[PDB]
Design a protein around this ligand. Structure first.
Ligand SMILES: C#CCN(Cc1ccc2[nH]c(N)nc(=O)c2c1)c1ccc(C(=O)N[C@@H](CCC(=O)O)C(=O)O)cc1
Ligand SMILES: C#CCN(Cc1ccc2[nH]c(N)nc(=O)c2c1)c1ccc(C(=O)N[C@@H](CCC(=O)O)C(=O)O)cc1
Ligand SMILES: O=c1ccn([C@H]2C[C@H](O)[C@@H](COP(=O)(O)O)O2)c(=O)[nH]1
Ligand SMILES: O=c1ccn([C@H]2C[C@H](O)[C@@H](COP(=O)(O)O)O2)c(=O)[nH]1
Lengths: 316, 316
């Protein structure tokens, strides 16, 4: 079945995984070095053994493709994935008036009295952002994030570089290039950055008419962190191909520290019992071509037959 | 045997390798996505089925570790690997007086009348550099090269960042970090650069007391390009460990486009006949610790028993 590699990776870590403490102190079964591949021309590698929200993936990927970093677009799409990174500033501000949100993520992990206020103040910030146009401009904009990294590489002399764009250009002008790299790691922002990018760098490859891509990520939270990574990066491969007129090939996913949090194991042993069902089919709008405007209804997911959702706890 | 993975990779490309044209127009059997590992605590992965010059590797690696980019150090060590990248400027200059060296690399590939003059002018430039102190300052300095990338990351506001240093610092202050990355890919230099770095990015990993490293390279000239890459990056793993007081673990080598030039096949089929002999032993000076001054005689290679040298042609 199409997703097997991920179940094998999960399985693997569970066995030969070694214990490793965490920054956000927990334990983790970890492995260093691993590659898995999926032939995109055989189905979309969207996990069927667990409910995965393609809606979240798409909207998020379009945000990235717009080089947009303001949280407004995501909320607009009922997407809240990155909210916590905005809230961390809103609260660490002079304007913040209210429930001392210090370490709110951890306190809500088990959520006692802090629970309500945190999630209540959350509605606040998102209400503020979504409508207060100026608030959005200050607190909604995350700054350095995949989109700005991808399409707005802050140079040494003020100008901006659109890596992704100039890359598709590269694929078009001369596809057989070993220089099709889109780096997200900048040495000067990483030390003073909330969360250095996980999906660090990706390289495309054109041969026999098909487009293949390789994603390198220094860290991998296998339970909930990998199933999104796979899909999103498999989606980018159809978009580029469709843009450049290439037939989609296969997506390769290489990991630095691949791991399973110590408080995720029950849930993962649980998943390993179900058997994968036929891979979902991705459908792409034939009319529009400039992927940079390939909005929500331009990407359609056909016949996804997932196993129920397995809840787990945020890694704080 | 220790090197098997490389012979398997060679073997692989020869079989399921697909044809691919080149920038420097030749043909190439290519594969996209591949990882191979070596347990450094079992021997030094220095190929025994072909003579590999450890001298060249060391001197070159120390140049890198000094953040030095001037070709003087290399010539000083009887090392000429990077010369061609210096000559390309010396000749593309107002000062150049003599044999129009245009495309000298290609013309010398089959070397007719151009042969002598090119190699003669080469002695010239290197004689100039090695002794003419000021000449060295202008034409010897390559500018953007692994060393300066590693230890002199040109920031947005003039200052310089020593990635490698701050990284060993990271390994020391807190080893269990998934953020130990040393990137060599800079989005703004790559488009106006002679040869964008191949060995693009490497991440270390500390666990169970051992240091493991993963090297990502977008391109791999398997015949002569990989056997150096393996060794050099395996050497860096002993140096860091020895510096940080860690036991060496294993080195992981991941490739973007791994390939075998169409005019290298005979030589590679040739190699695949010999059987690997016990791996060489690396010896490290116990006294000095600051790897940045771990000079030539501080690294010793014990009992290397290689098969004879298989000549091949430079990929122009
Ligand atoms: C990926 C990504 C972007 N993100 C953000 C993101 C940011 C930092 C991180 N940090 C750590 N340590 N682990 C992570 O998984 C992680 C993920 C996500 C955010 C939420 C869910 C989610 O809604 N629920 C999960 C699993 C349930 C849970 O564990 O709470 C789901 O299965 O849908 C998934 C991904
Ligand atoms: C690696 C590296 C740095 N380099 C530079 C370097 C730079 C650009 C490149 N470009 C291309 N296309 N292929 C390469 O192998 C390559 C290598 C090297 C330079 C010379 C030898 C060498 O002296 N001889 C070889 C093989 C003989 C041959 O093919 O000519 C040997 O086996 O020692 C090896 C590596
Ligand atoms: O998109 C993301 C963001 C985070 N993480 C994981 C990686 C780690 O498991 C943890 C963050 O700690 P660091 O890797 O940054 O050290 O979150 C992911 O898997 N995917
Ligand atoms: O250290 C090096 C330098 C170059 N090459 C190879 C990579 C390619 O095979 C060719 C250069 O073409 P590009 O990959 O840069 O496109 O040289 C190596 O293997 N190692």
């Amino acid at each position: 079945m199409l997703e097997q590699p991920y179940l094998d990776l999960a399985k693997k870590v569970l066995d030969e995984g070694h214990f490793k403490p965490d920054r956000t102190h927990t334990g983790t079964y970890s492995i260093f070095g691993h590659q898995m591949r999926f032939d995109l021309s055989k189905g979309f590698p969207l996990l069927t053994t667990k409910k995965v929200p393609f809606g979240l993936i798409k909207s998020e990927l379009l945000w990235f493709l717009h080089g947009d970093t303001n949280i407004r677009f995501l909320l607009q799409h009922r997407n809240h994935i990155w909210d916590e990174w905005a809230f961390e500033k809103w609260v660490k501000s002079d304007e913040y008036h209210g429930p001392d949100m210090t370490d709110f993520g951890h306190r809500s992990q088990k959520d006692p009295e802090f629970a309500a206020v945190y999630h209540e103040e959350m509605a606040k910030f998102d209400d503020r952002v979504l409508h207060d146009d100026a608030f959005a401009a200050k607190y909604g904009d995350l700054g350095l994030v995949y989109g700005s990294q991808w399409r707005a590489w802050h140079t040494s002399k003020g100008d901006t570089i659109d890596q992704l764009g100039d890359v598709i250009e590269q694929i078009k002008t001369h596809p057989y290039s070993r220089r099709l790299i889109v780096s997200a790691w900048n040495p000067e922002d990483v030390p003073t950055m909330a969360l250095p990018p996980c999906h660090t760098l990706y390289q495309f490859y054109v041969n026999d008419g098909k487009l293949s891509l390789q994603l390198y990520q220094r860290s991998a939270d296998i339970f909930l962190g990998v199933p999104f990574s796979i899909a999103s990066y498999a989606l980018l491969t159809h978009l580029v191909a469709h843009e450049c007129g290439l037939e989609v090939g296969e997506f390769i996913h290489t990991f630095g520290d691949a791991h399973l949090y110590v408080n995720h194991l029950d849930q993962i042993k649980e998943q390993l019992s179900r058997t994968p069902r036929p891979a979902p089919t991705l459908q792409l709008n034939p009319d529009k071509h400039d992927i940079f405007d390939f909005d929500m209804k331009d990407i359609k997911l056909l016949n996804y037959d997932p196993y129920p959702a397995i809840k787990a706890p945020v890694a704080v």
